[PDB]
Amino acid sequence: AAAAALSTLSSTESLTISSNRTLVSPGNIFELGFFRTNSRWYLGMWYKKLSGRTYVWVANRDNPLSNSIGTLKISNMNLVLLDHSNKSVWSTNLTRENVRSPVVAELLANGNFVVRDPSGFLWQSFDYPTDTLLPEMKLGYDLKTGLNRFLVSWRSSDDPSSGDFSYKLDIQRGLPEFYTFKDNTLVHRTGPWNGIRFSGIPEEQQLSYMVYNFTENSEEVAYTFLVTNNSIYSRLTINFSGFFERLTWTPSLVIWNPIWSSPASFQCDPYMICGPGSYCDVNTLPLCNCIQGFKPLNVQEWDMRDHTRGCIRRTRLSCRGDGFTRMKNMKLPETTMATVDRSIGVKECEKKCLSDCNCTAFANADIRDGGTGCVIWTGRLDDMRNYAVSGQDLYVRLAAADVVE
Amino acid sequence: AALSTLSSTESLTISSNRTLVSPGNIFELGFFRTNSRWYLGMWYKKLSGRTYVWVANRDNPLSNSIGTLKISNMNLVLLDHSNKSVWSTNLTRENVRSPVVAELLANGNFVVRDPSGFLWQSFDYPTDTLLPEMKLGYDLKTGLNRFLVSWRSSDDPSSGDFSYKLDIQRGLPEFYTFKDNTLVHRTGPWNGIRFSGIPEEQQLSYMVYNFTENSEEVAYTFLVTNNSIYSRLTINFSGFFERLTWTPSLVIWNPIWSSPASFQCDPYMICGPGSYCDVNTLPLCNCIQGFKPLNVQEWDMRDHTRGCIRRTRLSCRGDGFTRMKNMKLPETTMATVDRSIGVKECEKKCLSDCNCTAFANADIRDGGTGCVIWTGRLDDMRNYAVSGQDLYVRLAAADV
Amino acid sequence: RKTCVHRLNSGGSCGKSGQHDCEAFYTNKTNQKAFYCNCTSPFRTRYCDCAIAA
Amino acid sequence: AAANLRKTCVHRLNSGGSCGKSGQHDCEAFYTNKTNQKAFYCNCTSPFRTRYCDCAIA
Numbered sequence: 001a002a003a004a005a006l007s008t009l010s011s012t013e014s015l016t017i018s019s020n021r022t023l024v025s026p027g028n029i030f031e032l033g034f035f036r037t038n039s040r041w042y043l044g045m046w047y048k049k050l051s052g053r054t055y056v057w058v059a060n061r062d063n064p065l066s067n068s069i070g071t072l073k074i075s076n077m078n079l080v081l082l083d084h085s086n087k088s089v090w091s092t093n094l095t096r097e098n099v100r101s102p103v104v105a106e107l108l109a110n111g112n113f114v115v116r117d118p119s120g121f122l123w124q125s126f127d128y129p130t131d132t133l134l135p136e137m138k139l140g141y142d143l144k145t146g147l148n149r150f151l152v153s154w155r156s157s158d159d160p161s162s163g164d165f166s167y168k169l170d171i172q173r174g175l176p177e178f179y180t181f182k183d184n185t186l187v188h189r190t191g192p193w194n195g196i197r198f199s200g201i202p203e204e205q206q207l208s209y210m211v212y213n214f215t216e217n218s219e220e221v222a223y224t225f226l227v228t229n230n231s232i233y234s235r236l237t238i239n240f241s242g243f244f245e246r247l248t249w250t251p252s253l254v255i256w257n258p259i260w261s262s263p264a265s266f267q268c269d270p271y272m273i274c275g276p277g278s279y280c281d282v283n284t285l286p287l288c289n290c291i292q293g294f295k296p297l298n299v300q301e302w303d304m305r306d307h308t309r310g311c312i313r314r315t316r317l318s319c320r321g322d323g324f325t326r327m328k329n330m331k332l333p334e335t336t337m338a339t340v341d342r343s344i345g346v347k348e349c350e351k352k353c354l355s356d357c358n359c360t361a362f363a364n365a366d367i368r369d370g371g372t373g374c375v376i377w378t379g380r381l382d383d384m385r386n387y388a389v390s391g392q393d394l395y396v397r398l399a400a401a402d403v404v405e
Numbered sequence: 406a407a408l409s410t411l412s413s414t415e416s417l418t419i420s421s422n423r424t425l426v427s428p429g430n431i432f433e434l435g436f437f438r439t440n441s442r443w444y445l446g447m448w449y450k451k452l453s454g455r456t457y458v459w460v461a462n463r464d465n466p467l468s469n470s471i472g473t474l475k476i477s478n479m480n481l482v483l484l485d486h487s488n489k490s491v492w493s494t495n496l497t498r499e500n501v502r503s504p505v506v507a508e509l510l511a512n513g514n515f516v517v518r519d520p521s522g523f524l525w526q527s528f529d530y531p532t533d534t535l536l537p538e539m540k541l542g543y544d545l546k547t548g549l550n551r552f553l554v555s556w557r558s559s560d561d562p563s564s565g566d567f568s569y570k571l572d573i574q575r576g577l578p579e580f581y582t583f584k585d586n587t588l589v590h591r592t593g594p595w596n597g598i599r600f601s602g603i604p605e606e607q608q609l610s611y612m613v614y615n616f617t618e619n620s621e622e623v624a625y626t627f628l629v630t631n632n633s634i635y636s637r638l639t640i641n642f643s644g645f646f647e648r649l650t651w652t653p654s655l656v657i658w659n660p661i662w663s664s665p666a667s668f669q670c671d672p673y674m675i676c677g678p679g680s681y682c683d684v685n686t687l688p689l690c691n692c693i694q695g696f697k698p699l700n701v702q703e704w705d706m707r708d709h710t711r712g713c714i715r716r717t718r719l720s721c722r723g724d725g726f727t728r729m730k731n732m733k734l735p736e737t738t739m740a741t742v743d744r745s746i747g748v749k750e751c752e753k754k755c756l757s758d759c760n761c762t763a764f765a766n767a768d769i770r771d772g773g774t775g776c777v778i779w780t781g782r783l784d785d786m787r788n789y790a791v792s793g794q795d796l797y798v799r800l801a802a803a804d805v
Numbered sequence: 806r807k808t809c810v811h812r813l814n815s816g817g818s819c820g821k822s823g824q825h826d827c828e829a830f831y832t833n834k835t836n837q838k839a840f841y842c843n844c845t846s847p848f849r850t851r852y853c854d855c856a857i858a859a
Numbered sequence: 860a861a862a863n864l865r866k867t868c869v870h871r872l873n874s875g876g877s878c879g880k881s882g883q884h885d886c887e888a889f890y891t892n893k894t895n896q897k898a899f900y901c902n903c904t905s906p907f908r909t910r911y912c913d914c915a916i917a
């Protein structure tokens with residue numbers, strides 16, 4: 001009959017707080033409606049079947065409805081949220097002006113809350129994430145339109161307004177790299193795709209229920225996962241404390257189980273805990289290790305485990321005749337001053353690096369198939385760490401006297 | 406009249422700014438304000454950023470700027486605005502004579518004494534911090550366990566949720582971290598280079614430490630061997646027990662180590678019985694060689710609660726052992742120790758005891774000595790990449 | 806008489822319903838019902854302390 | 860008069876620990892100790908058991 005929730009909102013209908021009505025996706029996974037937290041009211045989306053509420057999306061997080069009066073409806077071919085005084089508190093800002101009737105709002109099976117035309121999607125929640133990436137969502141750039149889709153944490157456990165932490169892709173550098181910011185402070189670097197996985201999150205791997213990928217083409221630079229078992233819920237969320245995590249609902253545990261959490265190590269993962277020309281290692285003391293062929297810029301500081309100034313070459317470079325030390329199991333250093341040619345290989349890369357008197361290091365861009373592509377760095381090497389069982393080769397340029405064969 | 410002494414005719418008041426200063430000028434003891442409340446406390450004199458390493462009346466704050474510390478009727482007491490006692494030492498003697506004197510010693514020990522000796526010592530009542538020369542653990546003569554309780558928060562010095570304590574009613578003495586009544590992390594036994602669950606602690610150029618286990622005490626102590634260097638152990642409000650060394654060039658209390666070091670593998674029993682945590686594997690929890698998951702369906706979804714069991718029933722006589730590497734020894738609640746015998750003699754003894762499920766050396770120095778025997782399920786295990794210790798777990802011969 | 810504790814820990818956090826979640830977790834793991842369960846959550850870990858007899 | 864100003868820059872100093880009651884001034888002292896000069900000011904923040912110094916320089 002008609003007690004149960006619909007997945008549709010037509011132009012003549014409305015959803016209000018006082019009615020307690022919600023929208024439910026076909027397949028019954030997601031539910032959309034009003035909820036109360038921190039003395040404010042919000043429009044949002046959660047998992048329908050979980051007794052504990054997990055909000056995967058909030059429409060008006062920085063624009064709260066003041067009180068228990070709120071109305072969601074289509075107005076002049078636009079989705080709008082009106083408070084007690086008929087004032088719009090939130091709305092979709094249209095990408096067209098010649099939108100035709102009928103305009104319909106619709107919650108899809110994958111949790112996309114969508115405004116559409118007979119002509120197609122006009123607006124999508126999938127494009128405006130809160131703190132959470134769902135399966136099928138795109139994390140990163142839409143190149144045609146310039147839209148960077150990124151995550152921002154709730155301010156606290158109770159306050160969904162924009163927190164200090166954001167997890168975002170930055171493409172203004174040699175390679176696309178994910179970063180975690182706290183306001184404007186750069187606090188953790190996930191780094192580039194490698195391309196099995198991201199350099200700085202080695203736990204991410206294919207599971208029995210989900211696969212993931214990173215698309216870097218003419219249309220987009222973005223990350224996506226799909227869950228291949230409809231009865232399993234998995235998601236990526238940056239929590240209010242600044243950790244980016246994969247969480248999977250695991251019934252036997254009665255909990256959102258954290259598959260992984262980033263940063264994983266307070267010792268080695270924070271951004272630049274070791275200075276330039278050194279790397280962090282969780283199994284050594286001090287944590288920061290000079291690169292082979294380098295010495296500490298300030299030894300007295302270095303012995304006191306003050307690693308700030310980092311390390312420098314023992315011997316000045318002479319370009320012609322220089323060699324390399326091969327570093328193993330590495331998180332590649334930050335690519336602000338780096339270049340990439342994905343079409344050439346390791347030998348061609350060493351040659352190109354050797355020939356360039358400014359190149360200080362080089363590495364493969366992709367680790368699949370025994371490794372391909374060329375990444376070249378100039379200047380200081382920053383934010384390096386190693387791993388016991390993951391990571392990648394990095395060749396750092398040295399004067400001939402300091403090379404080992 | 407000393408800068409470190411408080412006689413019965415003297416006092417410290419909030420409004421006078423009067424303080425006590427240790428010989429050698431390292432510590433200063435007096436009133437300080439935080440979270441709108443006044444407290445009597447001790448800090449490093451020469452550091453401009455204030456670090457309170459000891460608080461007398463942490464759960465009994467003075468409401469306002471009026472307060473007095475003094476000897477009253479041969480007792481150390483803290484009086485509020487209405488001349489009412491808000492804190493005091495409740496003395497351990499009945500025939501105390503004059504002069505009763507309160508005194509700050511060079512090591513930051515704040516002491517009340519008689520002509521006959523110490524009546525009370527701050528060293529017996531730590532706040533959240535172990536300073537050099539302090540004892541962490543049991544006084545066997547008196548049965549008093551000296552342990553650490555964290556500040557509730559960065560501003561509120563009142564007793565927080567976290568405590569760091571020694572427990573000795575088990576095979577070997579083990580340190581634990583509790584949050585209220587919850588057992589949250591297990592530092593574990595002495596080995597005796599180091600404690601099992603804190604692999605970063607090591608002798609430094611400026612500090613040495615040891616664990617004394619004799620008839621008078623079961624406690625840990627470190628000494629700082631360079632007078633110009635400050636190092637300390639503190640359990641902070643977030644529940645991390647840490648070594649901190651003041652490093653001028655960093656302008657900070659530098660964390661030499663922090664425990665628990667890994668949210669992945671250090672929390673108490675993140676992996677079930679007969680399994681162990683490994684930070685470099687996925688799943689984190691690995692069945693012991695020769696064991697299988699008790700519940701496969703839960704295990705595949707990374708529900709490791711139930712843990713693992715032997716693939717093959719033991720037959721006592723004829724059983725073997727799998728040698729696990731780089732291990733944090735399992736909890737020693739149901740363990741025995743024999744320090745007189747060695748690894749070979751230990752294995753035999755284990756083999757001959759049909760209830761024995763695993764064994765290890767009691768000390769790792771000198772190639773290893775001593776014998777530790779476990780019975781029943783092995784709990785709260787994890788490995789390390791480059792540290793830890795050998796552990797032999799009993800298996801039927803066929804799986805050896 | 807007077808209660809004992811059954812202890813069940815895992816990755817994650819308490820959330821707003823830790824007590825109830827813990828009590829369900831106990832039942833799933835033991836096929837019994839606890840008097841109640843306490844839940845606390847530091848170190849990115851959920852600690853269920855379940856009151857059992859005894 | 861009306862010339863272009865010098866461009867403002869940020870200097871970064873990160874290490875284990877926290878900000879504390881005086882993070883900004885600590886960061887600034889830390890900066891001076893590291894560069895022998897004075898910054899306009901330093902912001903300090905402290906997640907992930909790390910003190911992040913963000914120093915405004917020319």
Ligand SMILES: *[C@@H]1O[C@H](CO)[C@@H](O)[C@H](O)[C@H]1NC(C)=O
Nearest residue numbers: 585586809810843854855856
């Ligand atoms: C549950 O919490 C209460 C309140 O602190 C405490 O008294 C009780 O002992 C706890 N129960 C368990 C099982 O630890």
Ligand SMILES: *[C@@H]1O[C@H](CO)[C@@H](O)[C@H](O)[C@H]1NC(C)=O
Nearest residue numbers: 184868869901902913914915
């Ligand atoms: C420091 O924080 C202020 C105040 O929020 C901010 O406006 C400024 O840009 C920050 N400065 C630096 C150097 O990051």
